[PDB]
Amino acid sequence: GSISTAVIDAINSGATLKDINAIPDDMMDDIYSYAYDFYNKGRIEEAEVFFRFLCIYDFYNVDYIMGLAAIYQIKEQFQQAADLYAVAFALGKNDYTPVFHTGQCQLRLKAPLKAKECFELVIQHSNDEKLKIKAQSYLDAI
Amino acid sequence: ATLKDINAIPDDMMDDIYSYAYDFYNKGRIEEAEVFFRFLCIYDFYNVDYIMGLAAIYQIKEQFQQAADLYAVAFALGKNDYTPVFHTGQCQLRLKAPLKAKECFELVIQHSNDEKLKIKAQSYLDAIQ
Ligand SMILES: Cc1cccc(C(=O)NN)c1
Ligand SMILES: [Cl-]
Ligand SMILES: [Cl-]
Ligand SMILES: [Cl-]
Ligand SMILES: [Cl-]
Ligand SMILES: [Mg+2]
């Protein structure tokens, strides 16, 4: 998956496609918009390939990671989604949406204590009042 | 309508992506090559070399029927090229279908003008019981 590719790239330390600027920003933006065109039409499998492609080229990109994590969550691949949401948070530390969605995933993974920690973080640190209500609704059910 | 039909990505960038897909393939980075060849086949299903790349990945992963299916399409997408038929013969042998495999290698021998490919096909035929 995306995470194992990132680790292999790091182990081998050899030149990556991004290291040589193999794909311009403008083309990456286009491919990202095509990925959502597929996603928005319900073509989830093609969207997944396109987000995997983006995450091979530029793994450390919150927008690409969040798109792939959403697909895994929809596909009920909850651990893969949770792992990617955590990468996104590490790279975009001021947005608690990935923490909220990780909480949902942990609930489906039968890890209510991990889910509780996620929803509590949202309520303590997010300034998104609507996201906080949603997190509290989950907490109320735990 | 394909993404290629509307020139969604410039030709030179697609060439680079194909070369990167083959780089992953040659380095044994099969998961990444598979993503890249799937990307290429979404962009232009009608490109025989893109299809052959994905079929090769499936064959390496021992998804022999899935490979054979794509090879039949590739044979339609190529220019009198019996290489996909040769690889279908290999897949059929792995699927325990030796008479189907024999027919594949015989077709290569009878129609192909690629002498090196025919040598390979004959070596398989010689071993079939
Ligand atoms: C994305 C994120 C950030 C912080 C904590 C968690 C978690 O799962 N705690 N149990 C997840
Ligand atoms: Cl937030
Ligand atoms: Cl837990
Ligand atoms: Cl198969
Ligand atoms: Cl048979
Ligand atoms: Mg507050």
* DSSP line for A88-132: HHHHSTT--HHHHHHHHHHHHTT-HHHHHHHHHHHHHH---HHHH
* φ/ψ (deg, to 5) at B10: -60, 150
**Option in B3, B13, B38 nearest A23 (CB):** B13
Name the residues around ion ligand 5, CB cutoff 5 A.
Answer: B 97, 99-100
Q: Which residues contact A113 (CB under 8 A, 6 or more apart)?
A: none
**A133 is in which domain, residue-wise?**
1-142
Q: Is A23 on the interface with B (CB under 8 A)?
A: yes
CA A62 to ligand 2 center in whole angstroms: 14
The span from the CA of B65 to the CA of A6, in Å, is 31
Give distance in angstroms: CA of B91 to centre of ligand 4.
Answer: 10
Ligand 1 pocket residue status of A118, Cβ below 6 Å: yes
Mutation target to probe the A interface, by most A beta carbons within 10 A, among B3, B18, B37, B39 is B39
Number of structural domains in chain B: 1
Residue with tokens 């990202």: A32
Separation between Cα atoms, residue A122 and residue A128, nearest integer Å: 9
The technique by which this structure was obtained is X-ray
DSSP state letters, B30-78: HHHHHHHHHHHHHH-TT-HHHHHHHHHHHHHTT-HHHHHHHHHHHHHHS
Chain A partners of B17 at a C-beta cutoff of 8 Å? 23
Give the separation between CA B2 and CA B22, rounded to whole angstroms: 22
- Shortest Cα distance, chain B CAs vs residue A102, angstroms: 25
Q: Is the CB of A99 under 6 A from ligand 1?
A: yes
Task: Give chain B's radius of gyration (CA, Å).
Answer: 15
Which of B9, B16, B32 has its CB closest to that of A56?
B32
C-beta of A104 in contact with ligand 1 (< 6 A): no
Q: How do the residues of chain A divide into helix, strand and coil, expressed in percent and rounded to 5?
A: 75, 0, 25
Which among A5, A17, A27 has the least Cβ separation from residue B9? A27
Radius of gyration over alpha carbons of chain A, in Å? 16
Ligand 1 atom closest to the Cα of residue A111 is 10
Q: Return all residues near A28 (Cβ < 8 A) that are at least 6 apart.
A: A54, A57, A58
Q: Helix B48-60 to helix B83-94 angle, to the nearest 10 degrees? A: 20
Q: Does B38 touch chain A (CB under 8 A)?
A: yes
Resolution of the structure in the document, Å: 1.6
For the record, the structure tokens of B67 come out as 């490979």
Torsion angle of the four alpha carbons A48, A50, A51, A53, in this order, in degrees rounded to the nearest 10: 120
